[PDB]
Amino acid sequence: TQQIVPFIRSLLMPTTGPASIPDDTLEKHTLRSETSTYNLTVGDTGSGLIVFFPGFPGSIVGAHYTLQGNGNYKFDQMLLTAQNLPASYNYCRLVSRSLTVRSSTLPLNGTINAVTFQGSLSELTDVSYNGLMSATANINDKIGNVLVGEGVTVLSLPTSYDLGYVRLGDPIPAIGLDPKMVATCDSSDRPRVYTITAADDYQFSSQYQPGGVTITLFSANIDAITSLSVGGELVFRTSVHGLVLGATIYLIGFDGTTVITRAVAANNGLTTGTDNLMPFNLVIPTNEITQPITSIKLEIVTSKSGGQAGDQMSWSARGSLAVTIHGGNYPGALRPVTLVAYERVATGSVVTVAGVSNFELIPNPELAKNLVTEYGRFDPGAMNYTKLILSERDRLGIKTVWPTREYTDFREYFMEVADLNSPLKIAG
Amino acid sequence: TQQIVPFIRSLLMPTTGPASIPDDTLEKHTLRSETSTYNLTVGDTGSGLIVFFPGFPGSIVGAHYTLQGNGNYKFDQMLLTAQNLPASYNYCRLVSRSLTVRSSTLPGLNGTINAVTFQGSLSELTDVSYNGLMSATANINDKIGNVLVGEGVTVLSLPTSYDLGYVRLGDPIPAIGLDPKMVATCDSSDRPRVYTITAADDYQFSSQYQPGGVTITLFSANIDAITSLSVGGELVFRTSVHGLVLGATIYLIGFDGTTVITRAVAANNGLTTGTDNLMPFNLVIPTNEITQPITSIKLEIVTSKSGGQAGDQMSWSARGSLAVTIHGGNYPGALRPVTLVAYERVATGSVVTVAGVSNFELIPNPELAKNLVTEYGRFDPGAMNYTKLILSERDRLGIKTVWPTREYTDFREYFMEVADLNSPLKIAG
Amino acid sequence: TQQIVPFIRSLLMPTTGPASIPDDTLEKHTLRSETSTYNLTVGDTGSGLIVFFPGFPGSIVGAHYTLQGNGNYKFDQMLLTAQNLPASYNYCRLVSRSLTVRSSTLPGALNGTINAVTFQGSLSELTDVSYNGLMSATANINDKIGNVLVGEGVTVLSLPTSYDLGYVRLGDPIPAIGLDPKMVATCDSSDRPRVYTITAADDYQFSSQYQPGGVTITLFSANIDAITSLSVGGELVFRTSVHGLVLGATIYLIGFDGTTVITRAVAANNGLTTGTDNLMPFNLVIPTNEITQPITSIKLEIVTSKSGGQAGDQMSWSARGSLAVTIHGGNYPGALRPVTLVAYERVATGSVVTVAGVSNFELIPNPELAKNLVTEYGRFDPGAMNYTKLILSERDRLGIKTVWPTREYTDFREYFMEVADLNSPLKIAG
Amino acid sequence: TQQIVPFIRSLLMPTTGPASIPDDTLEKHTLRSETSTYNLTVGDTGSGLIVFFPGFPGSIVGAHYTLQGNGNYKFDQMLLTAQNLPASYNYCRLVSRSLTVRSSTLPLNGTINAVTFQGSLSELTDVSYNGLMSATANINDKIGNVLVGEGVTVLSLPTSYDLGYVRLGDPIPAIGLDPKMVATCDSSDRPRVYTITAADDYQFSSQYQPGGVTITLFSANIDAITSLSVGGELVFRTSVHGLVLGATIYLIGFDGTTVITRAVAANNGLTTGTDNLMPFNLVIPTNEITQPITSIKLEIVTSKSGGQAGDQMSWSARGSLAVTIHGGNYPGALRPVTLVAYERVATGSVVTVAGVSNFELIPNPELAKNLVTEYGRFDPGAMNYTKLILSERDRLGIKTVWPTREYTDFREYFMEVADLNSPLKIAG
Ligand SMILES: [Ca+2]
Prior knowledge:
The structure is cut from a larger assembly and holds four copies of chain A.
Chain A: H1 6-12, E1 30-41, E2 48-52, E3 60-67, E4 73-80, E5 89-103, E6 111-117, E7 142-147, E8 152-155, E9 166-167, E10 170-171, E11 174-176, E12 182-186, E13 192-206, E14 213-224, E15 228-237, E16 243-253, E17 258-265, E18 269-270, E19 276-284, E20 293-304, E21 313-325, E22 337-343, E23 350-363, H2 382-391, H3 393-396, E24 401-403, H4 404-413
Antiparallel strand pairs in A: 1-23, 2-3, 2-22, 3-4, 5-8, 5-9, 5-23, 6-7, 6-22, 8-24, 10-12, 13-21, 14-20, 15-19, 15-21, 16-17, 16-18, 16-20
The complex binds calcium ion (CA).
């Protein structure tokens, strides 16, 4: 520390403002802060979960779920940046981010457990208040039973530097006959791909039914916050004449709710002694994803034209599908997740979220006319200092989740120099 | 500056030759320069536009458009590297590049130049007129106005990110096939760009019967492509009317409004009542089909009926989104920064001369690799820090992406004041 | 060199253990070593080829092929890491790797030599893979070694092809339930895909007389590379003047040994209508587990038959379209790219060619292991990367090879690594 | 640089005058400069090509070709030294050379592309204005789209030192009955040899023709500016009686034009069941070569004494030829070539060439009576300095082809000491 190092200051105290990442990604950019402010209402059980995406390169900060009588979560709302970055910028990179979670009202209130998990949302094996505590072995990535009144601070720590600029989901110039037409340029670099072999000569056998017989061929945990696509093909064989197949893909939210439902093939006759192809050509736009996607499943309906008492409908199925979630493997886009769980909070009280997110940004064409961009400030040793700090993360006690009181202490313990500027004022 | 720093020299004075980028991308490579030389002819209006892709990792340097009586641009030709890199190399990275635009011959001084570097791809520019260019950036060192054509302009490529991966060039891959016109390449793929177009969300179509059908343009959207791309996704059609037949075509439109590529996506396609009718998109567009930069995509649909009469009212509902993936499209330099050089008031028939040097890190193809030694880059510490410092002070140093050539020449000699032979190595021991 | 530099030590002497790569990719990770041990049996010809993927970010180390009487190679087995990384970890980055190849046992035989090269391309890109032909795959003298005695053996050392690489997703199983026992769901290496584009036809005219059973053609064949999952997309469009033509089409993915690895019917029994486009879409996804050996080429066959049929019937169609073969994470440096070939010949039939290696990784544990596996940011030492850059910059004058006569590598180890100095007065400090 | 180094000065600024090459070739010699001055006229297409032989040890500097409507070149003239060195000197060595090409009149004018190619003229795969640019990979051996008004400077850079003295094509004392008798002593050291196996049991078969049937047995690219010879033998076998063979060798110029035509065997009966020899004993003197030779071809005429409708004439041929071009492999004699191409220059305008060539020379016997010769000035470190400079050629930007403006700048940037001579004038 001398004066200090703008980047370290920004990284460890994001509410302080942005600084350019001192890596090798030399783009002309501009630096911005976006606040997040939410007043969430506590449900009947007095318990709930905030899912944060600490590294998300853009306006999505997290999602809030209330816990219900029956032990299920129920989606409340997305937690966003104050304004929608893709409306003004085309490219983006996360510099630093911190969020504060505490109670503000009562109609004192319970406790908080928090973890930073090194995987995407659907990968967590246990998301209960208590179960959170073992999502990492890292002591500085979990905090237990912090009083809600005092609150918790979530600090975003890096998962890789020299990251590319991410395209935001920015609207692209387009005209179309449909009012509800939407055209964007999506986060794409570093896609995540899931491959699901749904069937390898899977035999299906069942008696006839008016209305048909529905099965769930598979269900698989995947993650998506933004646009994705499904490709691939199932091949069906049969000895039985006049079978008609229906198939639907469901994308399921964290709360078990159907987020998206897409008929992949409806009313589709099967021919005897031939391959019957069922292609998958799904594109799911960002705006359709009303809450984080947590799993994908495929249902198949089998029915017969004629039909009787005992008819026995049978088919064989083979094939694999590929689920590409665009930009999904970009560190921060899905990957690190910070869960903040609260319980025993009085029903009707307010859980207050306040955060600052800092970005390197490239303006969209209209803003670029009035927004000057520059290469980052050069200070050598900024990156080495960051590397040193992170290297000593555990001995320094630099947490991703803090009791706010402890984070406040840390701020003043660190940051003991901010020294005006000695004789520039008297120099010459 | 001590002696100097090969990379800085190469970056600021590309005509000087190549140097390895001093980042962390440690590959065994070889360093090469490729010249670009063009003598472009000025059209009737005395006005035109050169689109440069200053950061393009490969042989595509830009494109020339003439401006026409009716105010439209008309494509002239691609501006390329002297030789086709993908014929000899498989992987590539741009080190540095500069280009010069000026007039040489006058027919039996000519006008002015405006230039900008725009931080987006070609189709993203809101205004591409000679005058309108000047506001594409707010950055004073990324625009230059009313430079005399005789003196000319210098385009200097400034970085948009280091630690970039090697890009696969569009290199031919060994292949045999029954078709003479068969082409197999391995394309720039890393860092794709993806556009998502929701063309319809229960869009109702309604119209009276027509012999030959009724054609509509469902959507049109600005996209960018110079190299291979693909279109995926699906539209779903519903209808109450029997015997409707659908035709659908995708058009990829050039900067000059011209159709570059036209692909029937579904021709003659009967719609069944009370069911989803699927129209999949499985398009792959190879690089060699893209004769000029793609600027927009549109989809037309033809609706016709088997029978047909006077008043028949054909109706359908449509739902679905498409995804346009342009391979390696988000790789910084591949589409992103664009430098426009516009000229006007140049006498018709005069020559606008382009001369450039492009510098590359390259990996040879298998046949060349047998005779082309590759190495890790020369190590000099502080090269990257010095680059970072220079760029950090870009504006106070006045390091432009577009220069009046005279000012760039001055800068060269102002900078580069040491190139000092090599003092007593010659007398050492 | 002072003490030394853990990373350089790991890079140049991988059997020594792992160290964090001193680049800018700051992830909380853990460091691990995985051994590779194989005892390969020499075939009838006394000759064979080991294909190594020195930079592979994961458990695939290489593949062994024996050479046969007829001059063809025949796949033996994949060479892997001791345990399957994707079963325990989700993300991975290669730190360093070295492998040893030597004779250990013989029947009865005093012959046997190794030629080896590191080729800066993927397997299918090599123009000549014969024992002798290897020697010209690079011009780099420190990337080839010739006629090393098999008894002494060869050392393959993995040298970097780029730092600041992203973590690669391993082919890790993803939680899934399904009606099929043989159901498999993974999250694959995807970042940095490789894409091949094949224009299979541009108004290609087909013409042939009728045949019971049909007339099969190979429309195209193209060299591609795949070790892990890939997909095929695109479309062919067929036109015809002849009524009642039925088309069959199959894609074959062919192994290095000319053997069919994967065969997928793309369209079987498919009637063509007169005066219209007839679409043949490609919607293929090939999962990793189906790829039993490295894929070296792709070909498409088309069968043309007619419902009726007679003596002279002349079946004709026109075809247009291109396909795209995406191999997931294929362009990630190391995934396909550098290949080291170790060829042996004149080894006595029935003798053992022994492979021993160590691979070092930066790893992120899967959710179950993450509960008990502490992860950290890498040890900071400044000048580690500069020192690496210096070393590599002077690679040729230092004689740092990717393929060594083992005896020469051993000498190099002791020539380098002349300081490992205990730790002077910490023991007496205060 | 101290004062400077005469040789480096001469090498980098040839217009400055000659200096002795500081190698080990210690001959008593004399130093001379010869200018080259040409005013070339631009043809109909406004386009043309100047071929320079930058290293030529003697009076041949280059050749000018105009480009024609049909895309062919047409030879204009040889570009020579001001006076014919072989008339006055017997031996010679090139020290340094520079030439300038620019427009001097109009009847504003076009552009120049230039390259130095490390091979002889006929070896260039592409000689078009645009194609030139890829003849080398060396950035300092090519220059693109230089304005003709400003012009280009060609600088000759070494291709080997410790070269022998070359015999010029000097006239030798001789008397003869023929007025047109010419006797010279030619550049011979380091011959270049081409070997052409024209036939290895090549079967010829064709129907009879009054006047015969002519074939071109082979055509091969070779290079010659000065004297050459053709040796070797073809052997013909046949089953057919009364066949008569004619054979002619053509040496073809760069412009596709026949430079030299020599009947090798005219009217030559073939005997059945025997080898029929056709020897090659050609000597081509320098003075017959009116423009650079670019290829050699051999035509054979086959005719029959009798002759009818269908007669079928057949022969088998075997043998190889050797083309020796005297002194051809002497570095500079054929080897490096610098091409200066211009286009878009107005028809009728003058392209002006001005150059200086510097030589080490040994006078002919008559001049030797009045021309003092000496061993070169000794300065140690001259050669090391040259080696250093050339070793750093690319970082110093020492080009073989320059935009003249850039070369002029270089001259004044270099050559910053030429310091009179401080107190010799005041010494003692
Ligand atoms: Ca870096």
